[PDB]
Symmetry: C2
Subunit: 49 residues, 2 copies
């Protein structure tokens, strides 16, 4: 749980700095980390568009 | 369960609202001393960055 959350926190920081190309990890987990990851991916795509 | 799962769901819903263009909704859990807190601060920084745009 701890490491993936740190990782996704990192991912959100890169998106904030304008890097809309960095891959979002953990999109395929079957739990709540998975759901958070799918959210961040959708956010990433929404900002590209 | 209440210490980890629920906050993650909540922040997940917060990211969805930002994605829909709602840059005014408050980001919960900014004051936790753990990794949820770190994530929450990240999302708040993202939110502010998108307003400035």
């Amino acid at each position: 749980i701890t490491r993936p959350i740190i990782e996704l926190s990192n991912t959100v920081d890169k998106i904030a700095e304008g890097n809309l190309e960095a891959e979002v990890p953990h999109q395929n987990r079957a739990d709540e980390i998975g759901i958070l990851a799918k959210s961040i991916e959708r956010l990433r795509r929404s900002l590209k568009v």
